[PDB]
Amino acid sequence: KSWVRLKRGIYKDDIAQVDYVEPSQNTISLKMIPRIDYDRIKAPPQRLFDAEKIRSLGGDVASDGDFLIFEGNRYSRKFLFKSFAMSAVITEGVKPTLSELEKFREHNFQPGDNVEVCEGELINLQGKILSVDGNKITIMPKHEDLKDMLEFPAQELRKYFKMGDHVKVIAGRFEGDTGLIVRVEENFVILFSDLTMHELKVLPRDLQLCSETASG
Amino acid sequence: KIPPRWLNCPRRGQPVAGRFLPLKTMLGPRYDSQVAEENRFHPSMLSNYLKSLKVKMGLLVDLTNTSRFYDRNDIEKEGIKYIKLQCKGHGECPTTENTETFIRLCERFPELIGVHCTHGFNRTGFLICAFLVEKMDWSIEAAVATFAQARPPGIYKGDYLKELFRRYGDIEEAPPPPLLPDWCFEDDEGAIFLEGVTVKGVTQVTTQPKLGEVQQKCHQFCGWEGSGFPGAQPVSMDKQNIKLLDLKPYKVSWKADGTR
Numbered sequence A: 001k002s003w004v005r006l007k008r009g010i011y012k013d014d015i016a017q018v019d020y021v022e023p024s025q026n027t028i029s030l031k032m033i034p035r036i037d038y039d040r041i042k043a044p045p046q047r048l049f050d051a052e053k054i055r056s057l058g059g060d061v062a063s064d065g066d067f068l069i070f071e072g073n074r075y076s077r078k079f080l081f082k083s084f085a086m087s088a089v090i091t092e093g094v095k096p097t098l099s100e101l102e103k104f105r106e107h108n109f110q111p112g113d114n115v116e117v118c119e120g121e122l123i124n125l126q127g128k129i130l131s132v133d134g135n136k137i138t139i140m141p142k143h144e145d146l147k148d149m150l151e152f153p154a155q156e157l158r159k160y161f162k163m164g165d166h167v168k169v170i171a172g173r174f175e176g177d178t179g180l181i182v183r184v185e186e187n188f189v190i191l192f193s194d195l196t197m198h199e200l201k202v203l204p205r206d207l208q209l210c211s212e213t214a215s216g
Numbered sequence B: 001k002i003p004p005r006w007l008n009c010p011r012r013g014q015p016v017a018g019r020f021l022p023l024k025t026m027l028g029p030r031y032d033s034q035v036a037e038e039n040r041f042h043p044s045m046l047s048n049y050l051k052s053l054k055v056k057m058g059l060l061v062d063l064t065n066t067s068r069f070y071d072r073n074d075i076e077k078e079g080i081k082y083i084k085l086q087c088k089g090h091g092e093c094p095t096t097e098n099t100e101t102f103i104r105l106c107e108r109f110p111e112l113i114g115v116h117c118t119h120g121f122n123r124t125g126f127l128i129c130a131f132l133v134e135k136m137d138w139s140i141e142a143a144v145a146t147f148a149q150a151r152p153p154g155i156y157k158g159d160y161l162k163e164l165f166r167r168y169g170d171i172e173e174a175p176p177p178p179l180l181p182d183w184c185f186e187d188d189e190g191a192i193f194l195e196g197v198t199v200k201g202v203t204q205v206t207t208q209p210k211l212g213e214v215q216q217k218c219h220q221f222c223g224w225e226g227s228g229f230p231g232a233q234p235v236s237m238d239k240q241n242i243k244l245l246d247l248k249p250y251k252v253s254w255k256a257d258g259t260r
């Protein structure tokens, strides 16, 4: 019940849900979204399989209720269900998204943002971000009243922001909205938007320091 | 020019069946020189109101057959889908094809669906009631009554009501058009009897039965074909008028400044 992406054909690198793994180690059944024009243009983006349209247009089509065979022995039901070779798919490194789930940790530090230190001997030192790396950043923050550049990894830092500053939301339900924060609690950071005056409570990690005007 | 009867028209009515928000057409800033601030209905006003209520509009259906009122981008930049649905002209009610187009569009789309024509009563209510009957299994009586109560007397064209009942009920049971409120005709073109004095025994007649009767009898006595005050209107004398005093007998009198 994993996800793969086909190698050859018109379905190249398209998300396919592995329905049934055939134990013969030759092919597996894959659930796909058809990239077809329903035999109307050819004598294409992904859209839902319309069985009524392919029954109306005719051609190579066989109907079994919701099961269907069409246009080069393509097997569909209710959604394609066709066998494809294991060597003709990539079974390692797909990682589909939430939109593909409907069809079928993380670190984000930016230069100029303000962060504090939550643990260690250098605790409660707020500094501005200079550079960024992948997992162990070894950041060089410009702290208050310190001309030297220290070193901090990602697990030690946290996106701390003083009350009354430009704030944006990076991801989640509140993304795209800006405003000002009011009171900084332990982790619940409440803010008011530039558009509306509704209370928006966010995690400290879901905040960034950007001085651009909101779009609206 | 701004459409007639628009300044006095309410911007929006109550939502119908929890799904449809009927509106009069918005007017963009291009009309600000013709519309006082208190009467303005920019698209931004609609979107800001919906934001203030934390309500999203999924789709706005424009039934005006024109793009001269406002910029559709003001709606689309807010994430609201905009559709211009052309309806039958010549004053006829929307065709069965128009209603099928409206139903096909709206069944794709909790969020509100905005519907507007120039004023937001006849085409808007016709299509909303058609959707209520065909898709939500309302009776046409209930649909017409509910739209009448949401946006005041929602459909006031008699042929629209007749066609709705012909399609969805009994045409012989179609209601007559409602009597219209006074604000409908304030822009088409006195309570004090005598100015400066208060006069006993003289009270203005607003009683609907006898008012029309007194006016009617005066019309018939004067032989007045048009509407309005039937009395003779004198015209101011100019150098081309005065030559008429030689061409037939005339009588003179001093004119006191008074009320006809």
Ligand SMILES: *O[C@H]1[C@@H](O)[C@H](n2cnc3c(=O)[nH]c(N)nc32)O[C@@H]1COP(=O)(O)OP(=O)(O)OP(=O)(O)O
Pocket: B065, B089, B090, B091
């Ligand atoms: O450009 C205008 C105008 O040239 C043309 N038009 C409108 N009335 C007439 C007419 O009596 N005779 C001629 N030759 N041309 C005419 O129509 C163009 C605009 O069309 P509209 O969409 O504005 O027509 P409208 O919807 O206003 O009619 P109605 O729905 O109000 O009845």
